[PDB]
Amino acid sequence: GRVRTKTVKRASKALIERYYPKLTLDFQTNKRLCDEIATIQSKRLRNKIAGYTTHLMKRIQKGPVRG
Amino acid sequence: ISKKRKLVADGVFYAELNEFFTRELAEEGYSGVEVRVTPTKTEVIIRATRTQDVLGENGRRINELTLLVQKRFKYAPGTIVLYAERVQDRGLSAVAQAESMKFKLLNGLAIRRAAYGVVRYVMESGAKGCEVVVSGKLRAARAKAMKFADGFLIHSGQPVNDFIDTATRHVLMRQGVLGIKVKIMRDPAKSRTGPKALPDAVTIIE
Amino acid sequence: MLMPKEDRNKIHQYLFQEGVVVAKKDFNQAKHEEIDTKNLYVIKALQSLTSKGYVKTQFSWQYYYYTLTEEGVEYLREYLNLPEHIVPGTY
Amino acid sequence: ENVWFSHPRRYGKGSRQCRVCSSHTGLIRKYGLNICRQCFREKANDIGFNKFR
Amino acid sequence: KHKKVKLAVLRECSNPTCGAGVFLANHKDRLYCGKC
Amino acid sequence: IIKIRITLTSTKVKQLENVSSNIVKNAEQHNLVKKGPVRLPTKVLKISTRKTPNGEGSKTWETYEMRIHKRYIDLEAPVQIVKRITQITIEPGVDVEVVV
RNA sequence: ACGGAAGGGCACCACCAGGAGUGGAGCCUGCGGCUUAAUUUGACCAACACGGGGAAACUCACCAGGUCCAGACACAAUAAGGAUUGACAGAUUGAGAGCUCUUUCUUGAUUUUGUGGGUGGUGGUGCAUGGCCGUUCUUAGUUGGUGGAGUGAUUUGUCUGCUUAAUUGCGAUAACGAACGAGACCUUAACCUACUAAAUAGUGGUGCUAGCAUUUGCUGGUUAUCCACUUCUUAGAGGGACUAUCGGUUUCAAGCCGAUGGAAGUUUGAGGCAAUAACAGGUCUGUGAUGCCCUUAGACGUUCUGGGCCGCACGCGCGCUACACUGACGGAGCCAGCGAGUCUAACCUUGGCCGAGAGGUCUUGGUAAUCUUGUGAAACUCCGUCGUGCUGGGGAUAGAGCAUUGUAAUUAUUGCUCUUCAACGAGGAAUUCCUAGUAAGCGCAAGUCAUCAGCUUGCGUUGAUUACGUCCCUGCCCUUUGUACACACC
Ligand SMILES: [Mg+2]
Ligand SMILES: [Mg+2]
Ligand SMILES: [Mg+2]
Ligand SMILES: [Mg+2]
Ligand SMILES: [Mg+2]
Ligand SMILES: [Mg+2]
Ligand SMILES: [Mg+2]
Ligand SMILES: [Mg+2]
Ligand SMILES: [Zn+2]
Ligand SMILES: [Zn+2]
């Protein structure tokens, strides 16, 4: 499956909790901004966190969400 | 000699030195050797907890070790030299801890007391987790195994090759052999080389 | 073991002149790598006086290592009839 | 006696031995290790052979 | 079972390493010494 | 200006590239004519063994593989500049040979 | 824990749909049995081409014989009118073995004899052990702290439901917050006209130069013919995918299902690593890892000669070759990847010559992206002979000869040549593996190697059918449930 784990989901939560007046819903800018705002130890993990952050931004734009 | 066979034989030579120094400098707190090959002479760096008994009175012991390695591996005299400077941290070396607890068991000491002492020393020497497994005929029985662990220990993945120190010892009790497995989860923060945290650990700046 | 007295003297000469001996574990080798004596002769002259003392032995991958001690220095000094100033090479 | 205390050992399993344990079986002769397979499993990391895949 | 008969308290050949202490033994038509 | 070839071989790619970069930087800061560092194919010395020390169990195999990475860099330098570059690369773990 | 109880989920070590089979034959190999002087021995899903176990000698542990002490050392009896050692020739012995004897030379406190204590042992015990492995279990599982429940064992946390490969998450919630496992990670295989650089990689065109054609073009030698370049090749720092975008479906989400895009959309494919508890699982025959028991000079130490390990009324497992025309044979085509390789010595071999072949000989190159090597691999392709019959399928059995390795091929080591041409007509009941560059077919390299693959480890060439599910069989996970089970339904 493509179920994102806690290591990805919680990191995306924290990024969105502190950087909402920040990175938009574009994945490329989201990941390039994760590159500077977070010390992620693998390109794959940073890609996954950025993708989940983009997902959460897109789902916020349709209304708010828990967390 | 081809490069393949030469570096294979270099690894073999390092392994042979490692076993020799394990058997020779065991009571001296040996923890590992480093072989540096220079164009003129080869330096053999011993890492020991107590580098005064390795040296000996006025260097007699280290000089006889040098000449022993000299004769064994057939170098021209003067082309190989030994330096036993220091181990950076006694408590973070699995080899040193395993040998120390082996020596305590041999001198006569409760297994639980010795292992918990080793674990406590490792934990208070900055390690983020330690485990000691003592297996065998602890008392006359079906040769059970005891574990004594503190902290956490990731085992396993890649980070275990990255930073986990594992050492195994064979201890000779009057009824058979006890097996010592010492496993140290050193702190990734003070790595001073390589990754500074776990692969999944994410820190955010704000 | 039954080995000639002069062969044993050669073993003792070498042992006291360099201090330590490295011996193949081969009880058939014709001639010792450094000493002009049978490898078996070296190994057994050490399985000899080593047991009296005078030597510490370590096996370490099938290759004997013999190291001289203080009582060994004394014993070989007396045996080779040396003045008490010719220290072994290790010193 | 001394004339016959050995016959040729110039090839075969009895010519060689594990340089650690003097074992004639399961020998590694690739790259000239000359180490028995069990000893090699024990001390491959010291030699520099590691597991990657 | 080499007996080594006691040989209680009691001429020469080639190979001059045989230094006048190599007295020959004569069983019959023997020219062979102790050293060889 | 003698033409030498420096061969670097090691099992550790990080230190191999460290020494190679040190030498290239040295050559560029002393204005030599150098052929770039050629990375000859890394050779994976694999060896397959049986996991069990006996004959029992599922026939589970291991490959222990050691990667030997070798590089070669040939350039032209005077005697002083070959001596200095052969005395500056004393990094452990890399075997460095200078052939004229 | 179990259930011929229930509910949900899952697995080609299960099934469905199928493919390839195995079981039927020959032969190879292991196991049993029988035999033997011995046919050494362990192992009985998770034993049986497994012990890396392809044994002529060695290995070796077994069998018939034969030497040696490699019995340290604290000790006491032998010894400075010699403890003890070696011995030519002959008996004797397989043996040119001074084993022992004939006989008298050599050596000289280096050993002999007795005591103790040691030493070695592939001797026993894996049900005394370590270490390592295999399996439980390739599933998703496991555990504190504090709080809550219970007198307690214990329970919750660790969950109704959706979701996921996943104790993966959404969330729900007397638990909150965590740890291990999974994931993350590392190695590899894919792309990248992106950077860096390359007669140990390659390409354009200039030297030189053959053919063919001559309006200058094709093919190509120019391994020191220069310049330019890095697309192919190599290897470092990086890039790239995060299920991206869009539709639909969703509880409110986790997600899921399509399509486009894209090198790549099943964890991107394949692995490495891999928890808690275990097993009287294997290994004392890997270890100078090892406790105890046994032996230790007529040795169970070790060595040497010979033999055996292979033996053959028979049964079983893994295999190879086949039963043919989608084929055999013969010519011609001429297409890889993963690797290995000798300096104090014998490895990988090109090329020339000798030979029908196997092979031999004279040089060469290679310590290796440099030479073997483009490993000029085989299947396969094309054209012919065969023409359906145990045939020109199959190649067992056997005779003769010639080379090769080896101290030594007899019980044929292997190879080569000729010849004999067996069973085998597609295989019972059963039963194995498998879902895409996968199955299957094909060969090559490496490992064991002096010689010996029908084995394994990897590699590539050719490349389907089916399915995209299920819980029927065999099992696994979770939950509820019953239990007279706890050595746990054997
Ligand atoms: Mg993992
Ligand atoms: Mg078949
Ligand atoms: Mg024996
Ligand atoms: Mg509680
Ligand atoms: Mg519970
Ligand atoms: Mg058992
Ligand atoms: Mg057999
Ligand atoms: Mg029943
Ligand atoms: Zn070994
Ligand atoms: Zn004479």
Itemize the secondary structure elements and their pairings.
This is part of a larger assembly, with chains A (67 residues), B (206 residues), C (91 residues), D (53 residues), E (36 residues) and F (100 residues).
Chain A: H1 6-18, H2 27-37, H3 43-60
Helix pairs in contact in A: 1-3, 2-3
Chain B: H1 3-24, E1 30-37, E2 42-48, H2 60-73, E3 80-84, H3 94-107, H4 111-124, E4 130-135, E5 145-150, H5 159-162, E6 165-172, E7 177-184
Parallel strand pairs in B: 2-3
Antiparallel strand pairs in B: 1-2, 4-5, 4-7, 6-7
Helix pairs in contact in B: 3-4
Chain F: E1 2-10, H1 13-29, E2 33-34, E3 38-50, E4 61-77, H2 79-88, E5 94-99
Antiparallel strand pairs in F: 1-4, 1-5, 2-4, 3-4
The structure holds magnesium ion (MG) (8 copies) and zinc ion (2 copies).
The structure holds one RNA strand of 490 nucleotides.
3D architecture notes:
The structure is cut from a larger assembly and holds chains A (67 residues), B (206 residues), C (91 residues), D (53 residues), E (36 residues) and F (100 residues). Chain C has a 3-stranded antiparallel beta sheet with strand order 1-3-2. Chain C has 3 helices and 3 strands, in the order H-E-H-E-E-H. Helices cover 37% and strands 16% of the residues of chain C. In chain C, helix 1 packs across helix 3. With 53 residues, chain D is α+β, with helices and mostly antiparallel strands. Chain D is 19% helix and 8% strand. Chain D has helices at 37-42, 44-47, and strands spanning 27-28, 35-36. In chain D, strands 1-2 form a two-stranded antiparallel sheet. In chain D, a hairpin with a 6-residue loop joins strand 1 (27-28) and strand 2 (35-36). Chain D starts with 26 loop residues before the first strand and ends in a 6-residue tail after the last helix. By secondary structure, chain E is largely without helices or strands. The radius of gyration of chain E is 12 Å and the shape is extended. The two termini of chain E are 23 Å apart. Chain F is α+β, with helices and mostly antiparallel strands. Chain F contains 2 helices and 5 strands; from the N terminus they run E-H-E-E-E-H-E. The N and C termini of chain F lie close together (11 Å). Chain F has a single domain (1-91), classed as 2-Layer Sandwich (Alpha-Beta Plaits). Chain F has helices spanning 13-29, 79-88; strands at 2-10, 33-34, 38-50, 61-77, 94-99. Chains in contact: A-B, B-C, B-D, B-F, C-D, D-F. At the B-D interface, helix 1 of B face loops of D. One zinc ion binds at residues 13, 15, 18, 22, 33, 35-36 of chain E. It is classed as ribosome. The entry lists the keywords ribosome, elongation. Translocation intermediate 1 (TI-1) of 80S S. cerevisiae ribosome with ligands and eEF2 in the presence of sordarin. Chain A is 40S ribosomal protein S17-A. Organism of A: Saccharomyces cerevisiae.
